[PDB]
Tab-separated table of N, CA and C in Angstrom:
chain	number	residue	atom	x	y	z
A	3	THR	N	115.451	154.564	29.712
A	3	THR	CA	115.929	154.874	31.062
A	3	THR	C	114.980	155.877	31.732
A	4	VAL	N	114.097	155.408	32.644
A	4	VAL	CA	113.194	156.324	33.341
A	4	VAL	C	113.435	156.251	34.861
A	5	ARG	N	113.722	157.409	35.464
A	5	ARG	CA	113.891	157.551	36.908
A	5	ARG	C	112.556	158.072	37.476
A	6	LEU	N	111.962	157.328	38.398
A	6	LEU	CA	110.695	157.644	39.050
A	6	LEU	C	111.039	158.225	40.436
A	7	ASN	N	110.691	159.491	40.694
A	7	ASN	CA	110.865	160.172	41.985
A	7	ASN	C	109.480	160.301	42.603
A	8	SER	N	109.267	159.713	43.797
A	8	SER	CA	107.986	159.793	44.504
A	8	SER	C	107.788	161.205	45.043
A	9	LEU	N	106.544	161.600	45.345
A	9	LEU	CA	106.292	162.931	45.890
A	9	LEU	C	106.526	162.951	47.440
A	10	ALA	N	107.827	162.942	47.761
A	10	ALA	CA	108.598	163.008	49.014
A	10	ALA	C	109.739	163.987	48.588
A	11	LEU	N	109.327	164.938	47.722
A	11	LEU	CA	110.086	166.023	47.147
A	11	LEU	C	109.339	167.278	47.533
A	12	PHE	N	108.027	167.144	47.789
A	12	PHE	CA	107.115	168.249	48.079
A	12	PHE	C	106.221	167.909	49.235
A	13	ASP	N	105.692	168.934	49.907
A	13	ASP	CA	104.699	168.741	50.963
A	13	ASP	C	103.323	168.792	50.258
A	14	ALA	N	102.278	168.151	50.829
A	14	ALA	CA	100.915	168.092	50.264
A	14	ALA	C	100.453	169.406	49.653
A	15	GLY	N	100.124	169.363	48.366
A	15	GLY	CA	99.657	170.524	47.602
A	15	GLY	C	100.707	171.531	47.156
A	16	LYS	N	101.970	171.350	47.571
A	16	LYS	CA	103.039	172.297	47.239
A	16	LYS	C	103.849	171.869	46.017
A	17	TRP	N	104.440	172.855	45.326
A	17	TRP	CA	105.265	172.647	44.133
A	17	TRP	C	106.650	173.275	44.322
A	18	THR	N	107.096	173.360	45.580
A	18	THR	CA	108.380	173.902	46.025
A	18	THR	C	109.089	172.731	46.675
A	19	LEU	N	110.335	172.412	46.252
A	19	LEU	CA	111.095	171.277	46.787
A	19	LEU	C	111.397	171.416	48.274
A	20	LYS	N	110.960	170.420	49.059
A	20	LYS	CA	111.151	170.403	50.505
A	20	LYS	C	112.631	170.082	50.859
A	21	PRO	N	113.148	170.514	52.049
A	21	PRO	CA	114.587	170.319	52.361
A	21	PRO	C	115.149	168.908	52.230
A	22	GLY	N	114.345	167.909	52.601
A	22	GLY	CA	114.729	166.499	52.534
A	22	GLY	C	114.978	165.922	51.150
A	23	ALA	N	114.360	166.533	50.109
A	23	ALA	CA	114.406	166.123	48.701
A	23	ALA	C	115.806	165.944	48.082
A	24	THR	N	116.797	166.746	48.513
A	24	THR	CA	118.176	166.810	47.993
A	24	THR	C	118.836	165.425	47.752
A	25	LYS	N	118.663	164.482	48.690
A	25	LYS	CA	119.195	163.114	48.640
A	25	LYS	C	118.794	162.369	47.347
A	26	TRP	N	117.511	162.461	46.954
A	26	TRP	CA	116.967	161.805	45.756
A	26	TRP	C	117.269	162.554	44.489
A	27	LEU	N	117.348	163.883	44.587
A	27	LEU	CA	117.673	164.725	43.450
A	27	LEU	C	119.115	164.527	43.008
A	28	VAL	N	120.032	164.331	43.973
A	28	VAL	CA	121.444	164.146	43.674
A	28	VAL	C	121.704	162.774	42.956
A	29	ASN	N	121.045	161.661	43.375
A	29	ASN	CA	121.237	160.388	42.658
A	29	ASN	C	120.665	160.431	41.238
A	30	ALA	N	119.556	161.174	41.063
A	30	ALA	CA	118.923	161.421	39.771
A	30	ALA	C	119.855	162.251	38.863
A	31	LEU	N	120.588	163.235	39.439
A	31	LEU	CA	121.560	164.083	38.739
A	31	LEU	C	122.789	163.301	38.258
A	32	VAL	N	123.199	162.249	39.000
A	32	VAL	CA	124.327	161.394	38.616
A	32	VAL	C	123.983	160.629	37.303
A	33	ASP	N	122.740	160.099	37.232
A	33	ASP	CA	122.205	159.370	36.084
A	33	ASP	C	122.054	160.312	34.885
A	34	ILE	N	121.603	161.568	35.133
A	34	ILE	CA	121.434	162.624	34.122
A	34	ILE	C	122.785	163.020	33.541
A	35	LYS	N	123.809	163.200	34.398
A	35	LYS	CA	125.159	163.596	33.981
A	35	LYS	C	125.839	162.543	33.095
A	36	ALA	N	125.412	161.273	33.211
A	36	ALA	CA	125.917	160.168	32.395
A	36	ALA	C	125.329	160.223	30.956
A	37	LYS	N	124.020	160.569	30.829
A	37	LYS	CA	123.248	160.622	29.571
A	37	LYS	C	122.708	162.036	29.193
A	38	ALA	N	123.450	163.110	29.553
A	38	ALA	CA	123.048	164.502	29.275
A	38	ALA	C	123.058	164.895	27.779
A	39	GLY	N	123.744	164.086	26.949
A	39	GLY	CA	123.860	164.274	25.504
A	39	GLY	C	122.538	164.480	24.783
A	40	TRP	N	121.527	163.673	25.150
A	40	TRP	CA	120.194	163.746	24.554
A	40	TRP	C	119.201	164.493	25.445
A	41	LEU	N	117.913	164.472	25.066
A	41	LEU	CA	116.861	165.198	25.760
A	41	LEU	C	116.557	164.614	27.132
A	42	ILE	N	116.528	165.485	28.179
A	42	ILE	CA	116.118	165.139	29.548
A	42	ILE	C	114.639	165.567	29.609
A	43	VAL	N	113.733	164.591	29.682
A	43	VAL	CA	112.293	164.824	29.716
A	43	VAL	C	111.812	164.648	31.158
A	44	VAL	N	111.343	165.742	31.772
A	44	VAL	CA	110.827	165.765	33.144
A	44	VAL	C	109.279	165.808	33.076
A	45	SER	N	108.613	164.704	33.452
A	45	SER	CA	107.157	164.551	33.420
A	45	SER	C	106.586	164.490	34.819
A	46	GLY	N	105.557	165.279	35.067
A	46	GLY	CA	104.865	165.313	36.346
A	46	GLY	C	103.544	164.573	36.286
A	47	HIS	N	103.224	163.796	37.346
A	47	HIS	CA	101.981	163.016	37.447
A	47	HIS	C	101.447	163.044	38.866
A	48	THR	N	100.115	162.914	38.991
A	48	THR	CA	99.321	162.842	40.221
A	48	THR	C	98.421	161.578	40.146
A	49	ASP	N	97.584	161.365	41.172
A	49	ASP	CA	96.555	160.318	41.209
A	49	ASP	C	95.209	161.002	40.808
A	50	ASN	N	94.048	160.365	41.051
A	50	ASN	CA	92.756	160.962	40.676
A	50	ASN	C	92.088	161.780	41.796
A	51	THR	N	92.731	161.868	42.963
A	51	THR	CA	92.225	162.614	44.120
A	51	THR	C	92.342	164.114	43.843
A	52	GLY	N	91.191	164.746	43.730
A	52	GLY	CA	91.076	166.167	43.439
A	52	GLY	C	90.566	166.456	42.046
A	53	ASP	N	90.615	167.738	41.673
A	53	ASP	CA	90.153	168.190	40.372
A	53	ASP	C	91.193	167.885	39.277
A	54	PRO	N	90.763	167.251	38.151
A	54	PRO	CA	91.708	166.937	37.060
A	54	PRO	C	92.452	168.137	36.468
A	55	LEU	N	91.806	169.314	36.390
A	55	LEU	CA	92.429	170.533	35.857
A	55	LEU	C	93.528	170.990	36.761
A	56	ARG	N	93.235	171.078	38.088
A	56	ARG	CA	94.146	171.483	39.165
A	56	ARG	C	95.315	170.525	39.281
A	57	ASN	N	95.056	169.223	39.130
A	57	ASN	CA	96.089	168.195	39.213
A	57	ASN	C	97.060	168.243	38.029
A	58	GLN	N	96.569	168.608	36.840
A	58	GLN	CA	97.394	168.764	35.631
A	58	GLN	C	98.359	169.942	35.843
A	59	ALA	N	97.825	171.087	36.312
A	59	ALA	CA	98.565	172.308	36.605
A	59	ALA	C	99.652	172.046	37.628
A	60	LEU	N	99.278	171.356	38.730
A	60	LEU	CA	100.160	170.989	39.829
A	60	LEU	C	101.285	170.057	39.373
A	61	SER	N	100.974	169.069	38.514
A	61	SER	CA	101.971	168.128	37.983
A	61	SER	C	103.022	168.824	37.121
A	62	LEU	N	102.630	169.861	36.356
A	62	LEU	CA	103.557	170.651	35.539
A	62	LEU	C	104.464	171.505	36.431
A	63	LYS	N	103.887	172.190	37.430
A	63	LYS	CA	104.604	173.005	38.406
A	63	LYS	C	105.657	172.186	39.179
A	64	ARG	N	105.350	170.907	39.457
A	64	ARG	CA	106.256	169.975	40.126
A	64	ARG	C	107.402	169.526	39.222
A	65	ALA	N	107.113	169.291	37.926
A	65	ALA	CA	108.085	168.938	36.891
A	65	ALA	C	109.030	170.127	36.647
A	66	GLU	N	108.491	171.361	36.660
A	66	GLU	CA	109.271	172.590	36.496
A	66	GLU	C	110.235	172.758	37.674
A	67	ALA	N	109.781	172.474	38.929
A	67	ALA	CA	110.582	172.539	40.167
A	67	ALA	C	111.780	171.604	40.101
A	68	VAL	N	111.587	170.366	39.578
A	68	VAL	CA	112.657	169.372	39.411
A	68	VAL	C	113.654	169.837	38.336
A	69	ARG	N	113.160	170.359	37.191
A	69	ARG	CA	114.016	170.878	36.117
A	69	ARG	C	114.881	172.019	36.637
A	70	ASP	N	114.264	172.999	37.364
A	70	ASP	CA	114.949	174.161	37.937
A	70	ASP	C	116.122	173.741	38.801
A	71	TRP	N	115.934	172.712	39.650
A	71	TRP	CA	116.966	172.163	40.513
A	71	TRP	C	118.068	171.570	39.658
A	72	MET	N	117.712	170.716	38.665
A	72	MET	CA	118.703	170.073	37.796
A	72	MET	C	119.519	171.112	37.030
A	73	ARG	N	118.851	172.168	36.570
A	73	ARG	CA	119.428	173.249	35.788
A	73	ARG	C	120.372	174.110	36.646
A	74	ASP	N	119.862	174.681	37.741
A	74	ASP	CA	120.639	175.559	38.618
A	74	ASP	C	121.642	174.846	39.521
A	75	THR	N	121.191	173.829	40.277
A	75	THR	CA	122.063	173.096	41.189
A	75	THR	C	123.001	172.113	40.427
A	76	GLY	N	122.551	171.550	39.307
A	76	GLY	CA	123.345	170.619	38.501
A	76	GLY	C	124.191	171.229	37.395
A	77	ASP	N	123.957	172.519	37.090
A	77	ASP	CA	124.642	173.351	36.091
A	77	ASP	C	124.496	172.819	34.641
A	78	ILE	N	123.257	172.429	34.271
A	78	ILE	CA	122.867	171.894	32.958
A	78	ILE	C	122.088	172.995	32.221
A	79	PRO	N	122.367	173.265	30.921
A	79	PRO	CA	121.616	174.329	30.220
A	79	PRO	C	120.119	174.041	30.119
A	80	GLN	N	119.295	175.105	30.172
A	80	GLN	CA	117.835	175.058	30.048
A	80	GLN	C	117.410	174.278	28.801
A	81	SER	N	118.152	174.447	27.695
A	81	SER	CA	117.930	173.831	26.387
A	81	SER	C	117.944	172.294	26.387
A	82	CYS	N	118.562	171.680	27.405
A	82	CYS	CA	118.688	170.227	27.536
A	82	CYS	C	117.435	169.560	28.094
A	83	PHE	N	116.443	170.360	28.525
A	83	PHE	CA	115.215	169.856	29.132
A	83	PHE	C	113.944	170.081	28.350
A	84	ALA	N	113.004	169.151	28.556
A	84	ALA	CA	111.631	169.170	28.086
A	84	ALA	C	110.789	168.913	29.349
A	85	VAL	N	109.880	169.832	29.714
A	85	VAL	CA	109.033	169.596	30.885
A	85	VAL	C	107.565	169.476	30.508
A	86	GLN	N	106.895	168.522	31.167
A	86	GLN	CA	105.483	168.234	30.931
A	86	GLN	C	104.720	167.823	32.187
A	87	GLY	N	103.434	168.111	32.175
A	87	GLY	CA	102.509	167.768	33.244
A	87	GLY	C	101.395	166.941	32.659
A	88	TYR	N	101.129	165.778	33.255
A	88	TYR	CA	100.123	164.837	32.768
A	88	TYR	C	98.925	164.708	33.673
A	89	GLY	N	99.034	165.175	34.911
A	89	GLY	CA	97.964	165.097	35.893
A	89	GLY	C	97.668	163.665	36.261
A	90	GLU	N	96.412	163.252	36.066
A	90	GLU	CA	95.935	161.902	36.366
A	90	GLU	C	95.841	161.022	35.120
A	91	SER	N	96.283	161.570	33.975
A	91	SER	CA	96.153	161.016	32.641
A	91	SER	C	97.043	159.783	32.342
A	92	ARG	N	98.245	159.624	32.971
A	92	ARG	CA	99.140	158.479	32.696
A	92	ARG	C	99.467	157.633	33.942
A	93	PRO	N	98.493	156.885	34.533
A	93	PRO	CA	98.829	156.099	35.735
A	93	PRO	C	99.726	154.885	35.499
A	94	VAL	N	100.546	154.521	36.511
A	94	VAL	CA	101.380	153.322	36.471
A	94	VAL	C	100.596	152.154	37.052
A	95	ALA	N	99.729	152.447	38.020
A	95	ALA	CA	98.874	151.477	38.707
A	95	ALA	C	97.423	152.009	38.734
A	96	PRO	N	96.383	151.157	38.960
A	96	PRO	CA	95.009	151.695	39.015
A	96	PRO	C	94.766	152.488	40.298
A	97	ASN	N	93.964	153.558	40.186
A	97	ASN	CA	93.599	154.496	41.255
A	97	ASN	C	92.497	154.004	42.205
A	98	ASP	N	92.035	152.754	42.039
A	98	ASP	CA	90.991	152.168	42.882
A	98	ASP	C	91.505	151.744	44.273
A	99	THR	N	92.835	151.767	44.445
A	99	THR	CA	93.592	151.336	45.613
A	99	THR	C	94.507	152.464	46.095
A	100	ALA	N	94.681	152.593	47.436
A	100	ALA	CA	95.556	153.583	48.070
A	100	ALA	C	97.020	153.353	47.674
A	101	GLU	N	97.456	152.073	47.576
A	101	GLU	CA	98.796	151.666	47.124
A	101	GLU	C	99.038	152.113	45.663
A	102	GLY	N	98.009	151.955	44.830
A	102	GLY	CA	97.999	152.350	43.430
A	102	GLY	C	98.135	153.846	43.275
A	103	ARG	N	97.290	154.583	43.996
A	103	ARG	CA	97.280	156.040	44.068
A	103	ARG	C	98.654	156.623	44.459
A	104	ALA	N	99.366	155.982	45.408
A	104	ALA	CA	100.695	156.367	45.898
A	104	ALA	C	101.749	156.198	44.831
A	105	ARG	N	101.582	155.166	43.968
A	105	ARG	CA	102.509	154.854	42.882
A	105	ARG	C	102.407	155.874	41.743
A	106	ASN	N	101.226	156.485	41.578
A	106	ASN	CA	100.928	157.478	40.548
A	106	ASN	C	101.407	158.874	40.877
A	107	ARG	N	101.555	159.194	42.163
A	107	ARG	CA	102.024	160.503	42.591
A	107	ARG	C	103.536	160.503	42.442
A	108	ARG	N	104.022	160.864	41.247
A	108	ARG	CA	105.453	160.872	40.975
A	108	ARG	C	105.882	161.894	39.931
A	109	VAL	N	107.187	162.218	39.930
A	109	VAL	CA	107.839	163.035	38.899
A	109	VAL	C	108.847	162.082	38.204
A	110	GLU	N	108.709	161.897	36.896
A	110	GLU	CA	109.586	161.008	36.134
A	110	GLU	C	110.624	161.774	35.343
A	111	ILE	N	111.842	161.216	35.237
A	111	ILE	CA	112.940	161.784	34.445
A	111	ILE	C	113.354	160.745	33.434
A	112	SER	N	113.072	161.013	32.161
A	112	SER	CA	113.356	160.119	31.045
A	112	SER	C	114.645	160.506	30.326
A	113	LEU	N	115.546	159.525	30.158
A	113	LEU	CA	116.847	159.632	29.485
A	113	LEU	C	116.985	158.528	28.421
A	114	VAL	N	117.840	158.726	27.396
A	114	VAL	CA	118.003	157.687	26.362
A	114	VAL	C	119.324	156.969	26.495
A	115	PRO	N	119.277	155.592	26.463
A	115	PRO	CA	120.512	154.790	26.572
A	115	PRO	C	121.497	155.018	25.427
């Protein structure tokens, strides 16, 4: 069970959740509340645009922002989460295309059935 949240959670270059994000975070929290028993793995990813070191750092900061919301706004213990940043290292689509690049800019939430 993997929930893919596009980066329409943050403004360009930012790792602070933008006001509009709440709508997508709440549907993700409903799915989390169903399968909270096991590990909630929050993984951050970017495309290849920019520096790979900076993009790895940014992807982790974005994954931490999503966990913080789930933890504080969703009232789930810190212990229930695993957060990771992958940068440009795990693409879903190839980065040779703008459509591909857009698909890679995401924060994923992994749950077990």
